[PDB]
Amino acid sequence: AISSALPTIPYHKLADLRYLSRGASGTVSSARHADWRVQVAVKHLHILLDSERKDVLREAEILHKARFSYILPILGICNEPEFLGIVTEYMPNGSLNELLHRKTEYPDVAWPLRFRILHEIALGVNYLHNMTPPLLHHDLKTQNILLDNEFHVKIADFGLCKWGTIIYMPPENYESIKHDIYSYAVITWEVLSRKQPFEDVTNPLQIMYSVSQGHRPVINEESLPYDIPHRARMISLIESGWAQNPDERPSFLKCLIELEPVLRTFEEITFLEAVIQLK
Numbered sequence: 437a438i439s440s441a442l443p444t445i446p447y448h449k450l451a452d453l454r455y456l457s458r459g460a461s462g463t464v465s466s467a468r469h470a471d472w473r474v475q476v477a478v479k480h481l482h483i484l485l486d487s488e489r490k491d492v493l494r495e496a497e498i499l500h501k502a503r504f505s506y507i508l509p510i511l512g513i514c515n516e517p518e519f520l521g522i523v524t525e526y527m528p529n530g531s532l533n534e535l536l537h538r539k540t541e542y543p544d545v546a547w548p549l550r551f552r553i554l555h556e557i558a559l560g561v562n563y564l565h566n567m568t569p570p571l572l573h574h575d576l577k578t579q580n581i582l583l584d585n586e587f588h589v590k591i592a593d594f595g596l597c598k599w600g601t602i603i604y605m606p607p608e609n610y611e612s613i614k615h616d617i618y619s620y621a622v623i624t625w626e627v628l629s630r631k632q633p634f635e636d637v638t639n640p641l642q643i644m645y646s647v648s649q650g651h652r653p654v655i656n657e658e659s660l661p662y663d664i665p666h667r668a669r670m671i672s673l674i675e676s677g678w679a680q681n682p683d684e685r686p687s688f689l690k691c692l693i694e695l696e697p698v699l700r701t702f703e704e705i706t707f708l709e710a711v712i713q714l715k
């Protein structure tokens with residue numbers, strides 16, 4: 437049984453600790469490690485409770501166990517009297533949300549990159565489902581799909597995972613291994629549309645009411661234009677992914693088997709050309 441312990445990092449090694457974003461999960465800051473000479477991110481708490489400390493230790497244990505090419509690499513934990521935080525690689529290219537919706541900043545996200553992003557999310561979630569015991573993310577949303585310096589996907593935010601918005605939640609969870617694939621489908625719709633799901637709906641409960649009656653983000657020529665590569669296959673994958681009956685949604689293994697032939701139609705250089713075009 438080959439084991440490794442998550443390193444502990446003294447707070448004083450984390451220089452230039454500057455705020456990046458607050459959230460529900462906690463506050464995320466950028467720093468640089470004095471010994472290692474690389475920029476890092478730290479997720480920490482707003483400046484010392486008991487079961488708050490339990491939650492962070494849990495998430496850090498998970499990240500450490502879930503290490504994978506498409507999962508945010510934990511570098512260590514800061515564990516001290518005054519300060520508690522998870523230290524990971526800094527993701528300089530933001531989240532997928534920002535990529536899709538900041539259209540002035542990113543007017544062209546070429547198709548090959550979008551497909552790669554969808555492929556890599558799938559590979560990341562699939563890995564988690566294939567752990568023993570399976571880890572279910574249960575909070576997949578475009579905000580939690582971070583993008584590295586090369587625009588590769590790192591999945592983040594393991595606060596609601598089991599060994600804010602409801603747009604990505606399947607109808608049955610309003611009061612299951614088929615949750616993540618539902619979230620995935622909506623993300624797939626979002627990525628291919630660059631639209632907000634249910635854009636023309638004021639109230640979340642109106643969405644929930646509609647979703648529980650079988651309605652889904654709209655699929656027409658306006659949402660998903662006719663020039664999308666593999667439009668028809670992608671629409672099937674979306675529609676099965678978010679099917680009303682959870683039993684009718686695919687496993688991520690099935691999903692990946694559907695994606696592989698699509699991803700193979702993109703030459704490797706077109707991903708690089710896609711990334712270079714971006715800000």
Ligand SMILES: NC(=O)c1c(-c2ccc3scnc3c2)nn2c1N[C@H]1C[C@H](C[C@@H]1O)C2
Pocket residue numbers: 456457464477478479508522523524525526527528529530531582592593594
């Ligand atoms: N690693 C990062 O760079 C992060 C993290 C982050 C850090 C540590 C942990 S431990 C569990 N999940 C996380 C997520 N969140 N964000 C990041 N990057 C950009 C987008 C926003 C803020 C930044 O502009 C969100």
